[PDB]
Design an enzyme around this catalytic site. Structure first.
Site, PDB file in Angstrom:
ATOM      1  N   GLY A  84       0.766  -1.225   0.000  1.00  0.00           N
ATOM      2  CA  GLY A  84       0.000   0.000   0.000  1.00  0.00           C
ATOM      3  C   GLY A  84       0.802   1.283   0.000  1.00  0.00           C
ATOM      4  O   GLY A  84       2.026   1.287   0.131  1.00  0.00           O
ATOM      5  N   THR A  85       0.076   2.382  -0.169  1.00  0.00           N
ATOM      6  CA  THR A  85       0.628   3.727  -0.168  1.00  0.00           C
ATOM      7  C   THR A  85       1.446   3.926   1.102  1.00  0.00           C
ATOM      8  O   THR A  85       1.221   3.249   2.103  1.00  0.00           O
ATOM      9  CB  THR A  85      -0.517   4.759  -0.188  1.00  0.00           C
ATOM     10  N   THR A  86       2.401   4.848   1.071  1.00  0.00           N
ATOM     11  CA  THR A  86       3.206   5.096   2.261  1.00  0.00           C
ATOM     12  C   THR A  86       2.532   6.171   3.130  1.00  0.00           C
ATOM     13  O   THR A  86       1.895   7.098   2.619  1.00  0.00           O
ATOM     14  CB  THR A  86       4.661   5.516   1.879  1.00  0.00           C
ATOM     15  N   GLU A  89       0.755   9.597   1.499  1.00  0.00           N
ATOM     16  CA  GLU A  89       0.885   9.688   0.054  1.00  0.00           C
ATOM     17  C   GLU A  89      -0.456   9.313  -0.578  1.00  0.00           C
ATOM     18  O   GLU A  89      -1.072   8.330  -0.187  1.00  0.00           O
ATOM     19  CB  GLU A  89       1.976   8.718  -0.420  1.00  0.00           C
TER      20      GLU A  89
END
Lengths: 244, 233, 250, 241, 212, 242, 198, 244
Positions: H30-32, H47
C-alpha cells in the site's frame, strides 16, 4: 472457515446408505453378544460381558442389562456411555407418560420414541450417531410380552428371538433352529445360554462373563416381575442347564 | 497457488490478495458499460442497456435513490438493488431524523462500509457489482465510483463495465472541457453520450438501448429512457 | 467469531473405531501410573507426583482430589483436563444432588455424572474427548466402599483393585497376586505402596508419592462440634510423614 | 446451529443428496397401489434377511394417516415415521380449522412439501423415502392414489409401484391395467395387485401383505389366508395352461 | 348498530343499518356494515368500526388465498372459523366485534355463522347483532315463517332494521338489504329511514304512536 | 469443500450457473404476449402411461390477472408460487388495487439470491438457489399485457415471447421468426402449440401439453383438454394446408 | 352458568347439557350441543367462559383423535381424563387460563364399566356416580343423594335425570332451554332425541 | 506437513500465524504513510497516488479523526482501515460516556490493539489488512502509535508503513538523532511533507497528492485538525525544494 473440518455425519452415499450408521453398526458387531427370547409365560434377556478381569467387581457391575421401567428392560450392544445417555432419556419418557395418563407406557410407544431420537442424529445436527443397539423386553396389557430391537439408524422391529452385537449371524441361525412358539421361560433361558455358549469367542462360558434377566408374571401374584439375576444365580442356572 | 486461496473471502493469498473480491470485480468487467461525469452545476449518468434476445428488454441500469441522488450499475443486478435500497434508506433516515439531505460523500462512506463487511467474514460473499453515484448536495455536483472491494472514489468523470477503458480515456482528455459545461444540461449529456460511444464496438446506441439520468442545481434526479433520449442519438 | 464448529469432531471410521477416543486413550497410556485398591474397611488411591522441575513445589499440585467428603479422585493422562473435570464434578455433586436431596451423592451416581460429562465431549460439536482416565473411590451409607474407573469414552466400571497409565499392565498383574476379599485398609495401603514402587524410577518417598484413602469418619476434620449425626469426612489425604512411616515397613 | 448446505447443485445440474436419497428407495422393499372403480388397494412385500419376528408388534408397512387415508412407502423405515407423524398431525389440524378431513391430494401436497423442504434447508439430508398415498376425499366415492418422492415431486396414478424391482412390476401393471375398465371389484383389484407382487416376491404368502380401502373410512387389511387364497387361485391360472 | 340475517325457504336475508357513533355523537349515517367477501359470501359488522372493517377485509384476503391454494371456493364454516380463530388469538386485548358470516355452497347450502370477539362461534337460522338487536328480534321473531316468499322475507328484514333504527338511539341512517341464493348474493338497495319510515307508516298503518 | 455462494474466476456464482443447468433438463414452457393477451403453454411430459397426466400442474394462477408457468425442478416452485400469491393478495389488502405484474415478478426474484450458509447481508436461510425458472404472465392498467422470465439468479427479463426448458434454444429460434407486434390471441395459441410440437419428444396431444392465457377481460384461465384438442386439430389442418 | 350434569348407572354414563347460549339480554341459540366426542366410547361436556369453552373441547378432541390414529387404539376413560386434567392444571398457571369446566363420561371396554369424571378449570378431578358443574349441583346433588341407586338401568337413569331437569326448570332463575341427553355405553355414544317430553 | 497457511488462527510448526503474515504483504503493497511526534503534539502525513486526472483533487481524504483529539492514518486495504476507525469511534464514545473524560491515547491504542488481536483468534474472520498510525494529545502529553495486522503496537518517536517505509524510517531516524531536544509542530509538518516526498521515489511512476494533519497543544489546542491552504503549500514547497 470451519466447513473444512466438518465430516458431514448425515449424508447419503452414492448408493443411498448412511455412512455413519453403517460404521456405527460395524462398531456394534464387535460388542459382547446380547440375546432376547420371548416365551408364552415370559421373556429372557442374556448378554456376554465383553472383556473381564480377576479384579473386576462383578457384584457391583452392569454393562448390558438395564431396567427402564418396572415392566420394561433393555439389553445393550455398543458404547456403554452412549447407551446410558439414551437409557436415561427413555426412563424420563416413561415417567412423563405415567404422569400424563396415569398408566404405564405401552412398550412400543417407548421403543418408538427412543428410535425416533436415534433417527434424528441421522438426519440433522451434524453429530455422530449413538453407537448402540438395544433389545427391549417388556410387558403391557395390550400386547403382553414383547421383544423389540433398535439400532443406530432409528429403525426398530419385533421378534420372538433375536440377538445383537457380535456373531449375530451364527446366533440367529441357532435360534431359528431350536425356537418354538410354545416355548416356556425356562426353555428359553436354556436356549439363550446354549446359543451364547456356541457363539462365544471365549474358551468357556462362565458366570462372571454373563448378565441375565427375565420378565415373568409370577403365577402366585398376578403382576409382572423383572429379575436381573445376581452373580450366584447365574452360576446356578449355568450348572443346571449343563454348562457347569 | 490461487486455487488454494480463493475458496472464500476470509483468506489472504501468500501475496496479500483476496481472490473472491477480485473474482467479484470480474463480474463488473463482464457488465455492460456505463459512464458518469459532472460539471459544477450538474452530474450525468449515461448507461448502455444490454438485452438477452431481440425479443427481450434492455435491463435498466439506473436507480434513483432520492430526489438529489442516484446511481448506475455494472454487474450483478440484484446486488445493485440491495445496495441502492440500503442507500435509499440511508437517504431516508437523514431526511426523517435530521431533515437533512444526505451528502454524496457520506453516502459513499456508508456504501464502502457495507461492502467491507462482506469481505472479512466467513459465509458471506463480496458484492458483484460496480456503481457510479451522482448527486447534488450542499457542496454542488458529485460523482462517485463504487467497487465491491469497498473502495469508493470521487471523480469529475469515469466509466465501468466492458470496454469502459475507451470512455474513460476520452473523459480524461475532455476533462477541461466538460467540467465547464455549467448551466447547460443538454451539453453535459451529449458530452456523456460521446464518452460512452467511445466504448462501443458491437452496435450503436439506439433509442430503447440508451439510458440517461441527470441531477443538478435545480434538477431533481430524473431518468430518461427511449423516446426521451432520441434527441441525443 | 462465534463457535461455528457445531458438528462432531469424533466420528465413526469404516472399521467402527472412534478415532479421537482411541487417541485419547493413548494419551492416558503415556500418563504417570495411578492405582486404587479396595479393602474391607476402606479404599486407597495413589499416584506419583512426577514433578516437572526441582524448582516446582510438588505440593501446590494435587493429583488426588476430594470431590465430596466421602469421595476422592485420581487420574492418568492430561493433568489440565483432570483439573477442570474435578471442578465440574464437585459442582455437579451440588447442583444435581445435594441441592435437591440435602445429602452428598453416592459414589456410583457422582461417577455416573462425571461419565456423562465425558461422554458428551465425545459427541457434542466442536470439542475433543477428555484425555484422561479417572479412578474414583468413595463411600456412601447404602453401598459401602467402592472404586470406579472412568475412561475417555464415558464408560466406567467398578473395581476391586486396578491401575491405569504408563505401567498399568504390570501393576494390574501385581495387584491380582496380592488382592483378596479380606484385606484391611492398612494392608491395601501397603500393597499400594509396593505396586507404586515398581512404577517409580527415581526417589520414592512421602514427597514424591501422593496417596489418599476413604475410610473411617474424621470428626477432627469436621471443623465443628455439637451435631451427633455429623461425624466428619471419610476422605483423607495421607501426609508426607504418614507415607514415610509406612515405607520403612515396606 | 448446524446449517451446512448438504443438498447442493453439481456442475451437471444435479443434487446428489436427493439423487442418492432415491437410491435408498430403490433398496427398500417394494410397494404397489392400484385403484379400482370403487376402491384402492395397497400391497407391500416383506423382506426375509432375518425371519423369526413377532408379526403382531413389528411395525406394519401401510399406515393410516386419518380414518379415510393411508400411506405406504419404500426406503428408510426410520425416516418414514417422521413423515407419517407430521401427516397425522396435519390431518387433525386440518379437521380442526376447516371442519372437514383432508382430501387425498391435500395430504399428499403436504407430505411432498415437507420432503421438498428437506432438500433445500441447511443442516439436513433429504428423506430417503417415497410414498404412495391413497383413500377417498370426504363424501366422495372416486378413488385416489398419489405418489411422492425425495425431491418433493408428487402426482396421481391409476396404479404405481416403488422400491426394489418396481421396474419389473410397473411393466406388469402397464400391460395389465386398462384405464378403460379398471378392476370393477374389490376382489379383482386385489388380484391384480397380488399378481403384480408375485412377479418379484417369488412365492411369499407371508411375504405379501395387502390393505383394501373403500369409501367412507372403510379400511381393512387382509390376513395371511385371505391373501394366500389369492396366490393359490393365481398359480392355477398359470398351470391351467 | 342493528344487523340481522335469517334463513328461510328462499335462502338468506341480510339487513343492516348504516349508523356510526362516537358515544352520543352521530359520526355517520352512511357507513357500509356489510362486506362482500366474494360472490357467495357476506360478512356483517357491529361493534368497533375499525376492528370490524379491518379484520373482515383481512378475512376476505384469507378466503381468496384459500381459493388460489385449494382451487375451490372456501366454505362458510371454514371462513367463519378463520375469523373466529383470529379473534380468539386476541382474546383479552379489547377487540370489539359482533359478526355474522353468511353464504352459500353446494356442500353446505344456505349457511349463517355468528362470530364475536369473545371467541363465540355459532351456526344458526336467525341472528340479530348489535345495540339494536332486541328491537329487530321483536319484529323479526313475531312474523318469521320458514315459508316466507323472497319478497316477504326481504321486507321483514327491512322492516326489522327499521324497527331498530326507530327505537335504538344508536341505530339508524339507512337500510342495506341482501338476498343470498346458490347463485350468490343479490344487493337489494339502500333505503334511507328518512323516507322509509313515513312510507312504511302510511302503507302499513303501524308506528301508530308517532304523530304524522 | 467450497461455499454455496462462491464466485468463479469468471465472475459467476457456481450454484446459480449449475442451477441453470438443471433448468435445461426441464420440460418445455413457452409464453407469447399479444395486444389481446398472453398465452402460456407447457409440455406435461408424464414419465409413464399409468400417471394421470391431468395431475401435472405446471401452469398455475398467481392472481386473477397473473398466471405462471414453470420449468426445471418443479417441486422448488411451490414456495415461489405461495410467495407470489401472498404478495399479490397482500398488496391488494394494503392498497385496494391489483399488484403490477412487474412488481409481483420483482418480489418473486427477491427470494432468488436468499441462499447461503450465513451470508453477511440479512438472514438468507436457504441452502441452495431454486432449480426452476418461471414464466410470469399478466395484465395491469399501466403496462398492459406482459411476460417475464424469472431465473434463480434473481434477474428477470421481459419478453414478447420466450421459451424455457429442454427445447428452448430451438423453440426460441422459432419464436424469433414467428413473433410480430400484431399477433392475435388465436395466432399466439396455435403458435405455442406448434413450437411445442416441434421440440417435444412425444407427439403433442391434449393430454401431454396444456395451454392457458390471461386476458384483461376474463383473467387467467387454464384451457381444459377439450378446448385445446380443437386448437390442435385446427393447427394440423393449417399446417397440412401448405 | 349453563347446566352440565352427568350420572353413571349400571352399564352406562348419561350426560345432560342445557341448550341455551345467552349473551347479555338475548338467548342467541336454543339448540346448542355442549359436547364433543373424544373417542367412540368417551364423551365430554363443558361449560364456562364464552370462547374458551369450545376451543378447549375441540383442542382436546383433536389430541385424542391423534392418539387413536397413531396407536390404532382407544385410550381408556381414566387415561383421557388424566390427560384432560393435566391440560387444565397447566392452563390455570398460564398467562390466560382456560375457564372451562368439564364432565367426562366414558365406557371402559376393557373393564366393561361406565365411568364419570368431573373436572373443574383448576384441574381438580374426581370420579363420581353423579356430578354437576355450576349452580346446578346445588339442587341436584342432594336430589340424587336421595334417589340414586348403584344398580340402576339406563332407563332408570334417564327417569332420574328427568327428575333433575324438572327441579332445575322449577327453581333455577335462568331459562336454560332444556337439555340434550347422550348415553355412553359398551356400544358407543347415542343421543336421546326424545327428552323434550320423555 | 503443509496447509498451515490456509486458515487464520492456525499455528505453523514454527509458531507463526501465516495469514497475519500475508495480511502484512497487503500492507507493504500500500501507499506510504507516516507519523511524527513533536514536543507538544503529533503530525500525520500520507501519500495519495493520483490514479488519473479524473480524481477530484483534495476530495478523497484518507486521514480520519476519532473523537476530537485523535488522528488515524493507515496503509493497506483502505476499507479495512475505515472499519478499524469506526470501531475506534464507538470505543472512544463508550469510554467518554462512562468516564466523562475523552479517551487517553494509550487507552485508545489498546482498544484498537485488542480488537485487531481478536481478528487473529478465529478462522471465521480474516486479519486486518492495514498497519495503522494514530495518536494525539491527552492529560499528559502527545503519543504516537503504530498497530500491525497482528495486533502488535508500541509507542513511537516517528513511524512509517507502506511501500516506502524504509526511506521514511531512514529519514525519521535522522530527525531523531539530530533533534534529541525535540522537533516542533511547525517543523514536524514540513519535515513530514519532505519524508512523504522522499519516500515517494518507490512509486515515482505515478503522480501523487500530499495530505497532512496534526494535533498540537499549542498549534491546535489539542484538537486534531487538517493542514490546509498556506501552511500546506509552505510545507509542499519546503519538500519540492529539498527534493533537489
Amino acid at each position: 472457515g470451519s466447513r473444512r473440518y466438518d465430516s458431514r455425519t448425515t449424508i447419503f452415499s452414492p448408493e443411498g446408505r448412511l455412512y455413519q450408521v453403517e460404521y456405527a453398526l460395524e462398531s456394534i458387531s464387535h460388542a459382547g453378544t446380547a440375546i432376547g427370547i420371548m416365551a408364552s409365560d415370559g421373556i429372557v434377556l442374556a448378554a456376554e460381558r465383553k472383556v473381564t478381569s480377576t479384579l473386576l467387581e462383578q457384584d457391583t457391575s452392569t454393562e448390558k442389562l438395564y431396567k427402564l421401567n418396572d415392566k420394561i428392560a433393555v439389553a445393550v450392544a455398543g458404547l456403554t456411555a452412549d447407551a446410558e445417555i439414551l437409557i436415561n432419556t427413555a426412563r424420563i419418557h416413561a415417567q412423563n407418560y405415567l404422569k400424563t395418563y396415569n398408566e404405564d407406557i405401552p412398550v412400543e410407544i417407548l421403543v418408538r420414541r427412543l428410535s425416533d431420537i436415534k433417527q434424528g442424529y441421522t438426519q440433522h445436527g451434524g453429530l455422530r450417531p449413538f453407537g448402540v443397539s438395544f433389545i427391549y423386553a417388556g410387558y403391557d396389557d395390550r400386547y403382553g410380552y414383547q421383544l423389540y430391537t433398535s439400532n443406530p439408524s432409528g429403525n426398530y422391529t419385533g421378534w420372538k428371538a433375536i440377538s445383537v452385537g457380535a456373531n449375530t449371524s451364527a446366533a440367529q441361525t441357532l435360534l431359528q433352529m431350536d425356537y418354538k412358539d410354545d416355548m416356556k421361560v425356562d426353555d428359553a433361558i436354556e436356549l439363550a445360554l446354549k446359543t451364547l455358549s456356541k457363539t462365544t469367542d471365549s474358551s468357556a462360558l462362565t458366570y462372571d462373563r454373563l448378565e441375565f434377566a427375565t420378565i415373568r408374571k409370577g403365577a402366585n401374584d398376578g403382576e409382572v416381575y423383572q429379575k436381573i439375576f445376581k452373580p450366584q444365580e447365574i452360576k446356578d442356572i449355568l450348572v443346571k442347564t449343563g454348562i457347569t | 497457488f490461487r486455487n488454494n486461496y480463493d475458496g472464500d473471502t476470509v483468506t489472504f493469498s501468500p501475496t496479500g490478495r483476496l481472490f473472491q473480491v477480485e473474482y467479484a470485480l470480474e463480474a463488473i468487467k463482464q457488465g455492460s458499460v456505463t459512464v458518469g461525469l459532472r460539471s459544477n452545476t450538474h452530474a450525468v449518468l449515461v448507461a448502455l442497456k444490454r438485452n438477452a434476445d431481440e425479443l427481450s428488454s434492455y435491463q435498466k441500469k439506473i436507480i434513483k435513490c432520492d430526489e438529489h441522488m442516484g446511481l448506475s450499475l455494472a454487474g450483478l443486478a440484484p446486488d445493485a438493488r440491495v445496495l441502492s435500497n440500503y442507500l435509499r434508506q440511508q437517504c431516508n433516515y437523514s431526511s426523517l431524523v435530521f431533515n437533512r439531505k444526505l451528502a454524496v460523500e457520506r453516502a459513499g462512506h456508508l456504501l464502502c462500509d457495507k461492502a467491507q463487511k462482506n469481505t472479512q467474514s466467513y459465509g458471506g460473499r463480496p458484492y458483484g457489482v460496480g456503481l457510479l453515484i451522482i448527486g447534488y448536495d450542499k457542496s454542488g455536483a458529485h460523482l462517485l465510483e463504487f467497487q465491491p472491494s469497498g473502495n469508493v472514489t470521487e471523480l469529475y468523470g469515469t466509466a465501468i463495465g466492458a470496454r469502459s477503458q475507451g470512455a474513460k480515456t476520452y473523459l480524461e482528455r475532455t476533462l477541461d472541457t466538460f467540467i465547464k459545461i455549467d448551466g447547460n444540461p443538454d451539453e453535459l449529456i451529449k458530452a456523456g453520450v460521446e464518452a460512452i460511444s467511445q466504448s462501443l464496438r458491437d452496435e450503436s446506441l439506439t433509442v430503447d438501448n440508451l439510458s440517461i439520468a441527470i441531477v443538478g442545481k435545480d434538477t431533481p434526479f430524473t431518468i430518461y429512457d427511449g423516446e426521451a433520449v432520441a434527441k441525443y442519438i | 467469531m462465534t463457535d461455528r464448529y457445531s458438528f462432531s469432531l469424533t466420528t465413526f471410521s469404516p472399521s467402527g473405531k472412534l478415532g479421537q477416543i482411541d487417541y485419547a486413550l493413548t494419551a492416558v497410556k503415556q500418563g504417570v501410573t495411578s492405582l486404587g485398591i479396595k479393602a474391607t474397611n476402606g479404599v486407597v488411591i495413589a499416584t506419583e507426583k512426577k514433578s516437572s522441575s526441582p524448582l516446582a513445589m510438588s505440593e501446590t499440585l494435587s493429583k488426588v482430589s476430594l470431590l465430596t467428603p466421602d469421595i476422592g479422585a485420581v487420574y492418568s493422562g492430561m493433568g489440565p483436563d483432570y483439573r477442570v473435570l474435578v471442578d465440574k464434578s464437585r459442582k455437579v455433586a451440588h447442583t444435581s444432588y445435594k441441592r435437591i436431596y440435602g445429602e452428598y451423592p453416592p459414589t456410583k451416581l457422582l461417577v455416573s455424572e462425571v461419565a456423562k460429562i465425558m461422554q458428551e465431549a465425545t459427541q457434542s460439536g466442536g470439542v475433543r474427548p477428555f484425555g484422561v482416565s479417572l479412578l474414583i473411590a468413595g463411600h456412601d451409607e447404602f453401598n459401602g466402599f467402592s472404586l470406579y474407573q472412568v475412561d475417555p469414552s464415558g464408560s466406567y466400571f467398578p473395581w476391586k483393585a486396578t491401575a491405569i497409565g504408563k505401567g498399568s499392565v504390570a501393576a494390574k498383574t501385581f495387584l491380582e497376586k496380592r488382592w483378596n476379599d479380606e484385606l484391611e485398609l492398612e494392608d491395601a495401603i501397603h500393597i499400594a505402596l509396593l505396586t507404586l514402587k515398581e512404577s517409580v524410577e527415581g526417589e520414592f518417598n512421602g514427597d514424591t508419592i501422593e496417596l489418599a484413602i476413604i475410610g473411617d469418619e474424621n470428626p477432627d476434620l469436621l471443623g465443628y462440634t455439637g451435631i451427633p449425626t455429623d461425624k466428619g469426612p471419610r476422605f483423607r489425604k495421607l501426609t508426607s510423614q504418614e507415607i514415610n512411616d509406612r515405607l520403612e515397613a515396606l | 446451529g448446524y446449517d451446512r448446505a448438504l443438498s447442493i447443485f453439481s456442475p451437471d445440474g444435479h443434487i446428489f443428496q436427493v439423487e442418492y436419497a432415491l437410491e435408498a428407495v430403490k433398496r427398500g422393499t417394494c410397494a404397489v397401489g392400484v385403484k379400482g372403480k370403487n376402491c384402492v388397494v395397497l400391497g407391500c412385500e416383506r423382506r426375509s434377511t432375518l425371519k423369526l419376528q413377532d408379526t403382531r408388534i413389528t411395525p406394519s408397512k401401510v399406515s393410516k394417516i386419518d380414518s379415510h387415508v393411508v400411506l405406504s412407502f419404500s426406503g428408510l423405515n426410520a425416516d418414514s415415521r417422521i413423515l407419517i407423524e407430521k401427516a397425522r398431525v396435519e390431518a387433525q389440524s386440518h379437521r380442526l380449522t376447516l371442519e372437514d378431513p383432508v382430501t387425498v391430494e391435500y395430504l399428499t401436497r403436504y407430505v411432498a412439501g415437507v420432503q421438498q423442504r428437506y432438500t433445500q434447508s441447511g443442516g439436513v439430508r433429504p428423506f430417503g423415502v417415497s410414498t404412495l398415498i391413497a383413500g377417498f376425499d370426504p363424501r366422495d366415492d372416486e378413488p385416489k392414489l398419489y405418489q411422492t418422492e425425495p425431491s418433493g415431486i408428487y402426482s396421481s396414478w391409476s396404479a404405481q409401484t416403488i422400491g426394489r424391482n418396481s421396474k419389473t412390476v410397473r411393466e406388469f401393471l402397464e400391460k395389465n391395467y386398462d384405464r378403460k375398465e379398471p378392476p370393477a371389484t374389490v376382489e379383482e383389484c386385489v388380484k391384480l395387485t397380488v399378481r403384480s407382487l408375485l412377479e418379484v416376491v417369488q412365492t411369499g404368502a407371508k411375504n405379501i401383505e395387502i390393505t383394501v380401502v373403500k369409501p367412507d373410512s372403510d379400511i381393512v387389511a387382509l390376513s395371511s389366508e385371505e391373501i394366500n387364497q389369492y396366490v393359490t387361485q393365481i398359480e392355477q391360472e398359470k398351470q391351467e395352461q | 348498530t342493528t344487523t340481522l340475517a335469517f334463513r328461510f325457504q328462499g335462502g338468506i336475508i341480510v339487513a343492516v343499518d348504516s349508523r356510526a357513533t362516537a358515544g352520543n355523537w352521530v359520526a355517520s349515517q352512511t357507513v357500509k356494515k356489510v362486506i362482500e367477501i366474494n360472490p357467495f359470501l357476506l360478512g356483517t359488522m357491529a361493534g368497533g368500526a375499525a376492528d370490524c372493517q379491518f379484520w373482515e377485509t383481512w378475512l376476505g384476503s384469507q378466503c381468496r388465498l384459500h381459493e388460489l391454494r385449494e382451487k375451490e371456493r372456501i366454505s362458510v364454516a371454514a371462513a367463519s372459523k378463520i375469523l373466529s380463530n383470529l379473534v380468539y388469538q386476541y382474546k383479552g386485548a379489547g377487540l370489539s366485534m359482533g359478526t355474522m358470516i353468511c353464504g352459500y355452497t353446494r356442500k353446505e347450502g344456505p349457511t349463517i355463522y355468528y362470530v364475536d370477539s369473545d371467541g363465540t362461534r355459532l351456526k344458526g337460522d336467525i341472528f340479530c347483532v348489535g345495540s339494536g338487536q332486541t328491537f329487530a328480534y321483536g319484529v323479526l321473531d313475531s312474523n318469521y315463517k320458514w315459508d316466507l316468499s323472497v319478497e316477504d322475507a326481504l321486507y321483514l328484514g327491512k322492516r326489522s332494521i327499521l324497527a331498530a333504527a326507530h327505537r335504538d338511539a344508536y341505530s339508524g341512517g339507512s337500510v342495506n338489504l341482501y338476498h343470498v341464493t346458490e347463485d350468490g348474493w343479490i344487493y337489494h338497495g339502500n333505503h334511507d329511514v328518512g323516507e322509509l319510515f313515513w312510507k312504511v307508516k302510511e302503507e302499513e298503518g303501524s308506528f301508530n304512536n308517532v304523530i304524522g | 469443500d467450497r461455499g454455496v455462494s462462491t464466485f468463479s474466476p469468471e465472475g459467476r456464482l457456481f450454484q446459480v450457473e449449475y442451477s441453470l443447468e438443471a433448468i435445461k433438463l426441464g420440460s418445455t414452457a413457452i409464453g407469447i404476449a399479444t395486444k389481446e393477451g398472453v398465452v402460456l403453454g407447457v409440455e406435461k411430459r408424464a414419465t409413464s402411461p399409468l400417471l394421470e397426466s391431468d395431475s401435472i400442474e405446471k401452469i398455475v394462477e398467481i392472481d386473477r390477472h397473473i398466471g405462471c408457468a414453470m420449468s426445471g425442478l418443479t417441486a422448488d416452485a411451490r414456495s415461489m408460487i405461495e410467495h407470489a400469491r401472498t404478495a399479490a393478495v397482500t398488496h391488494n389488502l394494503y392498497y385496494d388495487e391489483d399488484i403490477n405484474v412487474e412488481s409481483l415478478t420483482q418480489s418473486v426474484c427477491d427470494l432468488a439470491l436468499r441462499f447461503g450458509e450465513g451470508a453477511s447481508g440479512e438472514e438468507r436461510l436457504m441452502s441452495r438457489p431454486f432449480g426452476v425458472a418461471l414464466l410470469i404472465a399478466g395484465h395491469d392498467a399501466d403496462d398492459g399485457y406482459q411476460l417475464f422470465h424469472a431465473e434463480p439468479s434473481g434477474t428477470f427479463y421481459r419478453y414478447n415471447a420466450k421459451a424455457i426448458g429442454s427445447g428452448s434454444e430451438g423453440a426460441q429460434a422459432e419464436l424469433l421468426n414467428e413473433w410480430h407486434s400484431s399477433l392475435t390471441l388465436k395466432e399466439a395459441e396455435l403458435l405455442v402449440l406448434k413450437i411445442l410440437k416441434q421440440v417435444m419428444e412425444e407427439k403433442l396431444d391434449e393430454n401431454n401439453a396444456q395451454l392457458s392465457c390471461i386476458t384483461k377481460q376474463d383473467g387467467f384461465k387454464i384451457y381444459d383438454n377439450e378446448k385445446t384438442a380443437e386448437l390442435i386439430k385446427e393447427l394440423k389442418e393449417k399446417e397440412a394446408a401448405e | 352458568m349453563d347446566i352440565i350434569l352427568g350420572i353413571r348407572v349400571q352399564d352406562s354414563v348419561i350426560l345432560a347439557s342445557s341448550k341455551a347460549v345467552t349473551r347479555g339480554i338475548s338467548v342467541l341459540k336454543d339448540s346448542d350441543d355442549k359436547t364433543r366426542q373424544l373417542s367412540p366410547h368417551t364423551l365430554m361436556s363443558f361449560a364456562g367462559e364464552a370462547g374458551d369453552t369450545v376451543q378447549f373441547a375441540e383442542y382436546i378432541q383433536a389430541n385424542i383423535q391423534l392418539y387413536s390414529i397413531r396407536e390404532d387404539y382407544e385410550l381408556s376413560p381414566q387415561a383421557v381424563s388424566s390427560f384432560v386434567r393435566q391440560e387444565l392444571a397447566k392452563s390455570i398457571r398460564s398467562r390466560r387460563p382456560y375457564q372451562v369446566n368439564v364432565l367426562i363420561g366414558g365406557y371402559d371396554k376393557k373393564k366393561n364399566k361406565p365411568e364419570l369424571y368431573q373436572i373443574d378449570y383448576l384441574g381438580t378431578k374426581v370420579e363420581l356416580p353423579y356430578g354437576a358443574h355450576g349452580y346446578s349441583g346445588f339442587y341436584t346433588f342432594s336430589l340424587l343423594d336421595h334417589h340414586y341407586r348403584p344398580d340402576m338401568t339406563t332407563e332408570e337413569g334417564l327417569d332420574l335425570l328427568k327428575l333433575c331437569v324438572q327441579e332445575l326448570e322449577k327453581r333455577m332463575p335462568m331459562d336454560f332451554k332444556g337439555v340434550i341427553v347422550k348415553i355412553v355405553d359398551k356400544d358407543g355414544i347415542r343421543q336421546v332425541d326424545d327428552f323434550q317430553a320423555q | 506437513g503443509t496447509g498451515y497457511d490456509l486458515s487464520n488462527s492456525v499455528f505453523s510448526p514454527d509458531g507463526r500465524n501465516f495469514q497475519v503474515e500475508y495480511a502484512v504483504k497487503a500492507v507493504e503493497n500500500g501507499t506510504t504513510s507516516i507519523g511524527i511526534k513533536c514536543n507538544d503534539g503529533v503530525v500525520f502525513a500520507v501519500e495519495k497516488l493520483i490514479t488519473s486526472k479524473l480524481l477530484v483533487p483534495q476530495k478523497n481524504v484518507k486521514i480520519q479523526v476519532v473523537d476530537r483529539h485523535i488522528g488515524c492514518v493507515y496503509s493497506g486495504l483502505i476499507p479495512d482501515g475505515r472499519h478499524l476507525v469506526n470501531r475506534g469511534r464507538e470505543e472512544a464514545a463508550s469510554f467518554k460516556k462512562l468516564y466523562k473524560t475523552p479517551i487517553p491515547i494509550p487507552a485508545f491504542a489498546d482498544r484498537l490493539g485488542q480488537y485487531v488481536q481478536a481478528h487473529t483468534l478465529y478462522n471465521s474472520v480474516r486479519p486486518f489488512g492495514v498497519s495503522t498510525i494514530f495518536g494525539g494529545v491527552d492529560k499528559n502529553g502527545a503519543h504516537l502509535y503504530m498497530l500491525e495486522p497482528s495486533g502488535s503496537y508500541w509507542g513511537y518517536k516517528g513511524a512509517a508503513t507502506g511501500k516506502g517505509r524504509q526511506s521514511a524510517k531512514a529519514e525519521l531516524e535522522k530527525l531523531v538523532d539530530h533533534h534529541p531536544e525535540g522537533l516542533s509542530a511547525r517543523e514536524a509538518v514540513k519535515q513530514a511533507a519532505k519524508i512523504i516526498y522522499l519516500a515517494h521515489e518507490d512509486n515515482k511512476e505515478k503522480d501523487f497528492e500530499l495530505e497532512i494533519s496534526w494535533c498540537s497543544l499549542s498549534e491546535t489546542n489539542g484538537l486534531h485538525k487538517f493542514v490546509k491552504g498556506d501552511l500546506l503549500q509552505e510545507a509542499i514547497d519546503f519538500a519540492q525544494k529539498e527534493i533537489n
